[PDB]
């Protein structure tokens, strides 16, 4: 160990281990991280402009207020390394092998290191027309590393805004600066004014008297690393429940016993429903025995006031509703039906876009998941269910009610390969949430890590001189991050006679994408992660 | 203890470049690569 | 260990340990110190100008002479590191947790280190219009460290002038140069001249024939440190008596048995003092039995010729008197009554001022402490205490006497959080002082430390060439100081039925101060350190 010895090797690959029903996935990952001298060396607390596209006038009468970026934050001078994403860990072929051969999968445990620290200082030379730059490495400079295993810091580490290590192994990764929210009141009234067509800002402010500011320095112990030094996090063990890798097509009309039918005679005929049968029903039902009114033990899916905007303290937010496909109600392709709690992923060059300085999009609409599909407008309710058919009164078509209840069974989205976050923080409240709208894994104990790195400052000869001067020496670092997280799957075996339709690239896509270009530009394919049909019950 | 965070206070923070002096406001970045809900591209916003 | 290995980690946080009545506070602290090449490499002995605002004329007839900065010193080329202050060790929230949960606290022991030495040499380049500077680190340069555990050096390490490590953890700290007084005679006569309205300098000189000059080199052993080297002080154990964390509101009128009173009948009425009672008194007292003349065993507080100016050898000084609040005599707010032995703390950006190049102020007036309050002018004495009331003669209103005596009980100021010094040197004299005017802890044995660092000189090719040249190479260093001192407290439990009024920010202050700004500027709050009422007896 010393200046001239490399501290750790590069390993990025995954290998699978099959024994019996168990399959162990050990996915290594390694990244080359480029770190810049922190912008300012101090903690800052400030709020922001309202945002882009927020209305200045009432012409659209408050509907634009759904575009609100206003927030108040504290930005630390620390940079966040998180490996929370699928595709940081696995390339497309190895996620395919996972998704075909595994029925469900868990997180086993995580381990990660930092090493091969290199710190350089740029030195300008010349008159500025020549402007010769020189890159000298400072052997005694420090890089300082904070990891909170106690989760004392605000968590704020997930892919929303996609701050994560790059997906393809051979490109350099660039960190984003750590920051978290402080309490503020953004409340907006969209009912304001006569006729209730006006929107108004009720109270928009940063609340100071109740506020909590936690620096990295007082919270956790910080390791200081020279060039020959390395850092290891130690083991982190998950405890979470598995996620299903198969999608459910059954609604409550597909689930139960089948309506009595006599078979068709020849290839042209249709099945024929038996008129008089002895089964259970709901209301007074006798003459009209029908599979719609068959009593069932459970119901699959629930209605929601789809795209509910919350308008809580802190701003307008959105309350997801259940994921499902609009494909049954899809009809014409031109129009795009978002109502299935669909999600859209913007992404950049390092995150799997082919073109630099442009951002490709995806928008998963969850087409495979059906039978959970409930579009709120389509539903109805009646006063009475009887052998008689109600009148125009007693029948209500467009309520938009929340029908979630004790009888409902639903599915989470599952893992969304390239851009989806792996895990999440469990909010500590009475009645923890039942399931997550995005991240497939909930951490019952604290989530892993939240690793923070800052480049210690290099000050010039004179300190706090100010006077239109710069305080410290321009510096940057490059170091190598390596980690492995282990997965436990359960072997998938054929449950059907006919051929399955196996995982692969999305339907509209060709294979010339997803492969390197003449320049080396390529896109990573979306993989559903809930990839195959399975009987719900 | 009481919880002050809504779902707008909870998660990752919208990308912002800092203010320069004591009078200025933070400035929200126009073009960012994050997740959204419906088809959202041009209007990347912390609400959605 | 070597050039490319960091010698020690950054830890700045405190953690508390509660077992039974004992509470152990272990407060770590770590600082990044910026060290400049010493101004001159030699010891200098000189005296100074009289000072700013000292009178050149007798217009104010000697009253300005209270402004006297004149002194004679010897400045060593050494820089002093002292962690003697509250707020070097603790942030506001952790001093609050100390102050609420602890009844009293002691110093247990101190330990401190230096490591991650970085020494650079600045090299100018170009014609001076371009003036390109280059920062090269000299791997073989030395930083030399002296610590006297024997206290052979003049102590001179306390916060008066606030030479101490910065309070907030993430800013760099800059050392002040070590120096100490040599004997001189400043004596000033304010009684001079006919009518005794003239001030005159009796004898102002540096006394050479009796003088003592102690260098650092001959006094103590000096450690020399390259980059890969580190330094540890070893353990230092305090022996001192505890300090109360609660304030006493009782005077001698609040202390004893209560004057017999029959209760009031309804919500409007006042208590009624019994006319004829059998108690003790002082002089001949019979008909006028009164709580004022009740004999008591002790007396609380003492009078003093408040703001006594000493005018000893070496200059006019000031002899403190006892700390107390002027709030009972406060009346109108506009006027500011200083007479309670109040103290004022100037402070700078690194010491908790928000604005750079400006110095915020505080002035603790000790408002909570009452019942010790004695304003000298207000008092009086009589010839006889009898049932009769004396005449205009025999009664003397404005004496200003010192009433300290064998019967008096008093309080020290206590700990003053941001700017107050933790400990102090015990002057070695017959009859050591009873209690300290500022620092809460007296060191019965020697005080800790007094750590001194100098940056060893880097000489150019030719030595002692002089001739309008510079002797040595421009150099500076940055290194990391870490230390922990442990405290032993005693658990505080409720002694009352009603709610206490718990520690927090000062009354006039809001919470937008004390929190980082958009630039990151914030102020640390004053905390009283004697925070809650308690029965004196």
């Amino acid at each position: 160990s010393g200046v001239g010895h490399s501290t750790g090797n590069y390993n990025n690959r995954t290998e699978f281990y099959y024994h019996g029903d168990e399959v162990t996935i050990v996915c290594h990952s390694s990244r080359h991280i480029h770190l810049n001298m922190s912008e300012s060396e101090e903690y800052k607390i400030y709020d922001t402009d309202r945002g882009p596209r927020f209305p200045t006038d009432q012409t659209l009468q408050g509907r634009d207020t759904i575009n609100d970026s206003y927030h108040a934050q504290v930005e630390t001078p620390w940079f966040l390394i998180n490996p929370n994403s699928w595709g940081t860990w696995m390339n497309p072929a190895d996620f395919q092998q996972l998704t075909t051969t595994c029925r469900e999968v868990t997180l086993e445990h995580l381990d990660q290191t930092l090493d091969n620290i290199v710190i350089k200082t740029v030195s300008k030379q010349g008159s500025g027309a020549e402007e010769t730059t020189q890159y000298n490495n400072d052997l005694t400079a420090l890089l300082q590393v904070a990891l909170d295993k106690s989760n004392q810091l605000p968590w704020v580490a997930d892919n929303m805004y996609l701050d994560s290590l790059g997906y393809i192994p051979w490109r350099p990764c660039k960190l984003k600066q750590y920051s978290y929210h402080v309490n503020f009141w953004n409340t907006i009234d969209i009912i304001s004014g006569p006729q209730q067509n006006q929107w108004q800002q009720v109270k928009k402010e940063i609340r100071w008297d109740d506020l909590q500011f936690t620096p990295i320095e007082t919270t956790t112990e910080i390791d200081l690393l020279r060039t020959g030094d390395s850092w290891t996090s130690g083991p982190y063990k998950f405890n979470t429940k598995p996620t299903q890798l198969s999608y459910h097509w059954q609604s409550t009309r597909h689930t139960g016993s089948v309506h009595p039918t006599d078979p068709p005679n020849a290839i042209g005929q249709q099945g024929q429903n038996i008129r008089d049968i002895n089964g259970w029903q709901w209301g007074d039902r006798s003459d009209p025995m029908s599979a719609a009114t068959r009593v069932s033990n459970f119901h699959i899916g629930y209605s929601w006031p789809e795209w509910r905007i919350h308008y809580g303290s802190g701003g307008p937010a959105i309350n997801p509703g259940a994921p499902f496909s609009q494909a049954p109600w899809s009809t014409d392709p031109q129009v795009r039906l978002t109502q299935g709690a669909s999600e859209k992923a913007i992404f950049d060059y390092n995150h799997g876009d082919d073109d630099p300085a442009h951002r490709d999009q995806w928008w998963q609409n969850n087409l495979p998941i059906t039978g959970q599909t409930n579009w709120a407008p389509k539903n109805a309710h009646q006063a009475n269910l009887s052998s008689n058919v109600p009148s125009r009164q007693e029948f209500w078509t467009q309520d938009y009610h929340n029908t979630f209840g004790p009888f409902t069974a639903v599915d989470d989205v599952g893992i969304q390969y390239p851009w989806g976050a792996i895990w999440t923080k469990t909010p500590d409240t009475t009645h923890k949430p039942m399931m997550s709208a995005h991240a497939p894994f909930i951490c019952k104990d604290g989530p892993p890590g939240q690793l923070l790195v800052k480049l210690a400052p290099n000050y010039t000869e004179n300190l706090q001189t100010d006077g239109l001067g710069n305080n410290r020496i321009v510096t940057y670092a490059t170091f190598w991050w390596t980690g492995k997280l282990i997965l436990k799957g359960k072997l998938r075996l054929p449950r059907q006679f006919n051929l399955y339709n196996l995982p692969g690239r999305p339907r509209g896509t060709e294979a010339k994408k997803f492969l390197p270009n003449e320049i080396g530009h390529f896109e990573l394919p979306f993989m559903p992660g809930r990839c195959m049909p399975n009987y719900t019950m």
Side-chain angles (χ1 to χ4, degrees), chain A residues 106-109 236-242 424 426 441-447:
Chain A
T106 65
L107 296 174
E108 184 67 14
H109 64 78
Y236 170 82
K237 182 180 172 61
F238 293 92
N239 60 341
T240 46
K241 54 180 291 181
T424 189
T426 303
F441 295 100
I442 313 298
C443 295
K444 296 174 182 176
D445 187 2

Side-chain angles (χ1 to χ4, degrees), chain A residues 176-196:
Chain A
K176 303 301 285 185
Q177 190 168 355
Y178 180 80
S179 62
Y180 59 91
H181 297 285
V182 297
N183 59 343
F184 58 90
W185 289 353
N186 199 348
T187 59
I188 297 169
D189 184 6
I190 59 173
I191 302 170
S192 177
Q195 192 174 357
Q196 292 89 2

